[PDB]
A paper describes a structure:
In this work, we develop functionalized graphene grids with various charges via a dediazoniation reaction for cryo-EM specimen preparation. By applying onto three different types of macromolecules, we demonstrate that the high-yield charged graphene grids bring macromolecules away from the AWI and enable adjustable particle-orientation distribution for more robust single particle cryo-EM structural determination. The charged graphene grids provide different surfaces for protein molecules or macromolecule complexes to interact with, based on the target molecule’s surface charge properties, therefore allowing multiple orientations on various charged graphene grids and avoiding impairment by the AWI.
The cryo-EM structure determination of L1.LtrB RNP was largely impaired by the notorious preferred orientation problem on either holey carbon films or conventional supporting films. We used the NFG and SFG to prepare the cryo-EM specimen of Ll.LtrB RNP and found various views on the NFG and SFG, in contrast to only one dominant view on conventional graphene treated by residual air-glow discharge. The analysis of the orientational distribution showed that the negatively charged RNA chain plays a key role when interacting with the NFG while the polypeptide chain with relatively positive charges directs the interaction with the SFG. This means that the useful particle proportion on the conventional graphene support is 5.7%, much lower than that on SFG (35.7%) or NFG (23.5%), indicating a more friendly interacting interface with Ll.LtrB RNP particles on our modified graphene. This marked the highest resolution of the endogenously purified group II intron RNP, where the bases and metal ions in the catalytic center can be clearly recognized.
Numbering used by the authors: 1 to 599
Write the structure that this text describes.
Amino acid sequence: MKPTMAILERISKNSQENIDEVFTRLYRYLLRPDIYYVAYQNLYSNKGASTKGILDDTADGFSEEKIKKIIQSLKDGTYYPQPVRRMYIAKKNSKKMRPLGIPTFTDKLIQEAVRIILESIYEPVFEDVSHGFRPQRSCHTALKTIKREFGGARWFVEGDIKGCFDNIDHVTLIGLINLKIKDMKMSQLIYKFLKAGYLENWQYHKTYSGTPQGGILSPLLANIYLHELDKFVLQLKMKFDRESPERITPEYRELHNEIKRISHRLKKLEGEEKAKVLLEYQEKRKRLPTLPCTSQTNKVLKYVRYADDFIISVKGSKEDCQWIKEQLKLFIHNKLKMELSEEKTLITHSSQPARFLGYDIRVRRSGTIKRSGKVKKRTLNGSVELLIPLQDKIRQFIFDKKIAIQKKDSSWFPVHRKYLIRSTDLEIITIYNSELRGICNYYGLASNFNQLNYFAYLMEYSCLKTIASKHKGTLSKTISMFKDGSGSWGIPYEIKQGKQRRYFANFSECKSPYQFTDEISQAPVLYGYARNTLENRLKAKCCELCGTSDENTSYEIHHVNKVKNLKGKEKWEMAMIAKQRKTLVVCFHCHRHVIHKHK
RNA sequence: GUGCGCCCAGAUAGGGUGUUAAGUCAAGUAGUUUAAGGUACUACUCUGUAAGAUAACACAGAAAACAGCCAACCUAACCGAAAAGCGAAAGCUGAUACGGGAACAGAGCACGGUUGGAAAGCGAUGAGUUACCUAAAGACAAUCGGGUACGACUGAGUCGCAAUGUUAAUCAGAUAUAAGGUAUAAGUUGUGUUUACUGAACGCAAGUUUCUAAUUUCGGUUAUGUGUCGAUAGAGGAAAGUGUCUGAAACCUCUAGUACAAAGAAAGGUAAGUUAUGGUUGUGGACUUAUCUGUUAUCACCACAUUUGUACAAUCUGUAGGAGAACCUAUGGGAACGAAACGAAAGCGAUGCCGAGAAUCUGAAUUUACCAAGACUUAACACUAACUGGGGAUACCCUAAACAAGAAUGCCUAAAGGAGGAAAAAGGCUAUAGCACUAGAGCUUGAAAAUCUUGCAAGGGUACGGAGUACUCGUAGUAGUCUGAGAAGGGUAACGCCCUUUACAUGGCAAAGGGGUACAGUUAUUGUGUACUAAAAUUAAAAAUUGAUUAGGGAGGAAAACCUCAAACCAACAAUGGCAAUUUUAGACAAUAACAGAGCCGUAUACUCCGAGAGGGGUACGUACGGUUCCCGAAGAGGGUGGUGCAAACCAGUCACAGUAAUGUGAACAAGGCGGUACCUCCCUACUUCAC
RNA sequence: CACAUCCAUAAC
């Protein structure tokens, strides 16, 4: 009959085909409970699952009967999502709080389902220039887009919108949805989420090392709003550009044409008077790469957007670059009701560093003349060349985590992190290899990535001074205790296969600025394509520590996040070390007596 | 829970410190002197100066001692125990029998001792094999072509430092709070490091040790030898510097790693100051000073990077700033234009203390003018220790001493006879099957020697490691004037002080370790307080109603334009109306439970290291007594009166089955009993390693 | 463009 998940894929082709359909009758799909399994095939890969909203309902309970206790309450307009619990936290290096949000498990499975319906309709309407909270797009696709078609632009518009994600209008958002979805009971389910919700966002930009992925925490809602801007300026791109004929300058064509008249003469004679005209060939060559092959009267705008930033590269004047900053204020006022901050829409001319996603971003004008071998272009003119901010960002990291020390000649000398003596030699290197591999993998596109050598010096020699103090040893005895047999140093464990070693991270295996690893590798699980999942053990109705296959006892989910905190002396922790999984079933009689023996 | 470490007393059981006073000891050789002075002179002998080559005359030296270093041997204190006694074991005791044997700290408290002159460590090293790169880009062949101190792997064979220290000989004075040093607690949290608390016992003062910098290659290069594209050097390489055939007139190494001039100019080596430190206080490298006998003859020369200025180019040289780059000033390239790390901090002051040569000058100073102070040996005096002699109230282990206390065992012949007729278990007894018991099993046999349950005189062991303020016991004796005053003064200083007076045998700390009680402080529990004063930002203030608002209902299976379906209503800011622990205004406390050492300062006293000294670092906070905040230990192990289930199994009749009772019994996780394990606990314990 | 050493050893 197409079980619901082929009907949703039937729509995600349907938006692409009709270039404007008013998509009606979307509510009837949330109720057949087959899509409420892909919601449970999503909610296992999110970090923040222990913090709760106001009621004490723990983040589990995945049972087909509360599917009815869901889906029947989705019927008579009697599901109303939770009010606010403001357990405050503030952004790095600043005194600002941006409100933080969480539901009860119920809401997470409707929300994670109204995400999938709304992701079916809007995803082939999201324009290419957005790269924020999407599939198959991340931080690095934005950077890579800058490294191609931003190349060679005279000026920047390095925008900011004054709290763009707490200023989100709860009333003209829903007016925009209801151009597309012409459905009545959908919006009221959405508008239970707006004003009975929160505004529910974070600050920790360094969690993915320069990303607001925690540091904005929402579904796609924020993108649906902004897509009216990403529709506007890619409409502004056609009013702006007027493409002129002249690309190679007329100062350049008088020198470009006279090369071929005398290069045709160089082969007609070699000898002594060849060398005399070779001086008016080779010393005349000294203003040939000083002559440039580009013209700055043609007019070209670009646009890139992540979630809340956007950067706009324009081929023109500063007259022009203060007209684009004009016809944005006429917009984010009138059609989105927000202030594009005149303080911090920094126009910075391009040859100066911008700042977009934690990179410094700029065009090269340093007129060096390399070889490309027998052929020769200027490979460094007009190339957008991304850069770490070593002075803002890595300087901050090195001192925020207490690696280093400024010395009296300003030289940073590394010492031990005081609070890490309390773990093993394997725990500390896994502390430190994790931190180093994050920044380097973040900053792998950086044209001065080689410069992170100072940072990886400091990390490596401060990992060893921690392990030094715990053993009561020195920095030299600790490479001599942890010797190999090839001059490198490692950390041993006895595990089942014989001895291995933990080494330290690197460059060529954190650098690669074309390929990378696509889910941030914080002990990643496999794709369980052998039916080990959280859906076909539900149908087994099984009892592992239970023995009685009873219907009046509720089956559910016992998914806690972490497994390293389980000790193995109590009755419940001996099952999770055997099957090696975050989760199992939980009973109606099993949870309340065996887990809750003390409390 | 750091080897010792209590409290009073004594001073060789082993020792330490100080004081005088005798005796002896050794200064290259002689001389003079006194004297058995010692370095002063005189004369010779040997050595030292390569500070960047050798010789000739002047400056420094020449012993013995103790104190230390290093190495190899032999042996006190310590070990599972020999061994050995001991209600037999609970625990105690090891002249020497092996094991270490300088031990782990000498820092309060011995390892010693002979013999020799030298090891860790740290920089400059072969072997012993790399694995690699090889001046030709590569292909060709250890072509020792021709490196192997390229670093490996190797674990120590060569050179340097480590490898010394102390001991009187011109006297007094002069810029004596002189420069210049040193103390002036510790900690908590103010994190904008803004002038803040605590018996801080100092005062002022918010921005300071600190970097952003080198010009006739001092680039896009670390916080290093290096290694690579430019301007800029192409003649070897395109008949191998050993060879072969090449790529190209392209290919490597330096010079073009400076346009003048000044000087020093490699190595060792002296003494200062650094970095080395790190987390506080003392031994190797490497920077930086300065210093290494004057004069003659061969000897006396080519550097080279900076010390020095420019000298011009120069990148693109902070930058505040207006400025598509090869665009515009200006203190010009520390020149606040900016940046990063760092609290009653950096600095400056104020007080009491230290202040060598005897600064350099001034009078030195008179038979070289004066010197008695090293080390041992003996005596006398003074002191002194955590050493030595004395001195001992709670919890744990033990249980012999029938020491005090409850356990004595069968029936039938027929109670008469007794079981002394018979049997024979039972308390018993040996091994150890075995799963505790049954002791098997002949057996004293028919309560003793083994039922538990306690204990003095008992026998052991541990606690003498500071947290808050009041009481038991050995004693106010073990101390005759308490080092905490007796007792009063006496300021001080925070005190207890030490200073002045003064009491006479209860006059004195109230000798020791550990208990006990009353109220405190923190943590983990457990229950509740919740008007001692009620009303509020207003959290319970989407309620209701609302506002006369608003477009919008309810239970299910199709793609989107739309298949179907059974056939007068929730929601749209809030507003408005009582309270709860309290920020808005006040005459969260109960209840139980347990309990640790970071120091620091004052006087006394014991030690050591760095310093000329003042002082600083440590020794359990060194210890004691006075003061003070900070602060409120972890983990395993056994043990359990007290906890419980399960496979086996205990035993006659709790069970059959008869029997002279016991006896063969097939059947008790029907455990009548209860171990054997598993579990959660709950409790005790420096038992064991940690932590200071 | 740049791979990375020496950071000593020893008073509680």
